Amino acid sequence: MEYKVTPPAVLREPLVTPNKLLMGPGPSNAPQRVLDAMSRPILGHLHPETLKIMDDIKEGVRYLFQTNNIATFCLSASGHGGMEATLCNLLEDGDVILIGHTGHWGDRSADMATRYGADVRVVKSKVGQSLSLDEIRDALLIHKPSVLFLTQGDSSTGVLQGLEGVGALCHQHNCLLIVDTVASLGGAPMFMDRWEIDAMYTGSQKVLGAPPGITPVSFSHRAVERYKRRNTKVKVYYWDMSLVGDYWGCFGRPRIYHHTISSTLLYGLREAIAMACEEGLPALIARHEDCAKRLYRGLQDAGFELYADPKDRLSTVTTIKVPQGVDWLKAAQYAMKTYLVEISGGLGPTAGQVFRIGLMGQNATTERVDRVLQVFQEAVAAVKP
Amino acid sequence: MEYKVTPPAVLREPLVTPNKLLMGPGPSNAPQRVLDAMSRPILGHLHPETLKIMDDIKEGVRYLFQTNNIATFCLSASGHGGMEATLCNLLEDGDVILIGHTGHWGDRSADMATRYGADVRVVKSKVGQSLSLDEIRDALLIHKPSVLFLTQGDSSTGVLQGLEGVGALCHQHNCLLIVDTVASLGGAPMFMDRWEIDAMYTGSQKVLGAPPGITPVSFSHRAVERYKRRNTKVKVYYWDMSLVGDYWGCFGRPRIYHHTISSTLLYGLREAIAMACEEGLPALIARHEDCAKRLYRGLQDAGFELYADPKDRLSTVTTIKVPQGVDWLKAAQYAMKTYLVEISGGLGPTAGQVFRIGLMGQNATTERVDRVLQVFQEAVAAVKP
């Protein structure tokens, strides 16, 4: 009759959430408007007011993506969930996919594609570079894949992948084009429809500054056609484009129960998107690009070496070579302890090789560029001089 | 420079979120303490303060589940993600799973299991009843499965499934037991280890009254052993027990990046779990059971007929037969328009057959029982002759 496990003393303590300047590659600092909204009361997952918020979110993602795709919605999962769903829906066992590897995100997408039963091919960029159009074409011709996967902003290497003409080329060869824009959307140009992109997703917590955990996704008519010609059901009910699309009112069918959406995350995402739409893409993108340029000047004045090829830089995540003799983790710790500012190390192929400074959303301002420049310089100088 | 899609006018309007009394089967009304916590600033997904919150959550779930399992963590997905992940990790192609069907959740689990490539078998409850031990034993003998899946509280039928001795029986037959406790945990006795349950999950938005979208899960040593003997990687990186368990500090390995957890949902869940642990399981379960007893008296005095067998009722979700000549949807609309109180229809097998009144967390009080009884009776009286 005993309860062998007792109520944890730990939970009698107050919840502690220090207010930090998150100048890593994400999450970025939430606008106060988005934090306030997440105190709103919970709504039922199928209540008209919830569906209204979802509808408004769809219009906002269509703007941000520049698409008219009817199959536009959000996944109830973090950014990886976008990668998962896009692969899960558009691959069957033995389908050949080509991954355009420009950093860690090439490794992660290859992993998921293999877990889903695909025949995974990879074309690797030169170090610190994007893939050229020629390199992409050559690999397409060689592999003859049904899917090509590219990461527009690879946050591990700070590399922005060019996309003009690639969807067109894919479509000459019965190939679908999937693009990750988690780190890049709002910090670099994107025109989903104009660039013939078939499936695309972004993150809530990067340029948008919404909470992590809900991810906008869109599928073209060609991608929907692919889904319709599947011989077997997608492996995960949770990601099934038809079923979540129906919940999100995409295909003219009744709304029905698929899962309970997090109305909290809807509130924060909706306000974040409203803010971004009000600023407008041209101003939003320009602000991130201009901030990044200011960062480069300060870093290069101070004698630091940037990792990415200057032609290939992503505004939102700047990779900086760790100077000979500095302990990057100790530098990070110094910055956090003294200032409550986050500076980050690398990821995947750049683990231990770089620092990464994110300039995203609330943090892409001249004041915050200057702050991160100051504390980064101080932290590096502080450690083994 | 050409933006064919324009900033949506809809997002210029205020976000609107009416505060309703959610007396359907979930989500339930959030404590003010949980809503307040969700305005806290976002933290980095690997920051020590974040890992501390996750650690504290693990202690709380171990308490609520009554388990010492090291493989205890939360999934960054809604309740369906618990079912997905538990099936995904514990099934390989051709594995025989037996589903104990006591309502909708038997159909949904059978669905996911077939999607994941399992050889799916079903044993079905008598209408409005739980499965007996003999019925389970007989089915085990016929199918000889490697996993049995049961739903402790099936929210579609309002049925509580008895679990004493079933894990033991499963283990006598080289079978793992998976149990869904989304609707039942906190509203009915549960002792995961004592009852020899191998995998279990709950929902954040039911008894706990946290936001939807993060789901506590736990796996026994036997379950972990099953995982370790797979010859194939789990199909979804996002659900992989080993990888999310490592992010959650479960297996003695370094914490690494798996995905960006949602700060906001952590805070809400942390607070909800803290509150439940402070009340304690004995008082928490008793409160739900007593509130349900009060509701049954009120309903039966008013001449309504309960759907579930008196011996098999789930405290947290009460199924009520829709009287002859009542439009259930119309009655629900009436209650929502006049009082902002939610009463729900049916789900899956009970769709169009029942009303469902949830008594969960903040809404399991004598006052709220009396409120829903008053509005339910008024709403039904309004649409009937």
Describe it:
Two copies of one chain form a homodimer. In chain A, the strands form four sheets. In chain A, strands 2-10-9-8-5-3-4 form a seven-stranded mixed beta sheet, sandwiched between helices. In chain A, strands 1-12 form a two-stranded parallel sheet. Chain A has a two-stranded antiparallel sheet with strand order 6-7. The first copy, chain A, is built from twelve helices and 13 strands. In chain A, α4 (104-115) links the parallel β3 (96-101) and β4. The first copy, chain A, folds into two domains: 1-30 and 280-385, Aspartate Aminotransferase, domain 1 (Alpha-Beta Complex), CATH 3.90.1150; 31-279, Aspartate Aminotransferase, domain 2 (3-Layer(aba) Sandwich). Helix content of chain A is 38%, strand content 14%. In chain A, α11 packs across α12 (366-382). By secondary structure, chain A is an alpha/beta fold. The N and C termini of chain A lie far apart (62 Å). The longest helix of chain A has 21 residues, at 281-301. The PDB classes it as transferase. The entry lists the keywords Alpha and beta protein, PLP-dependent transferase, transferase. The assembly is dimeric.
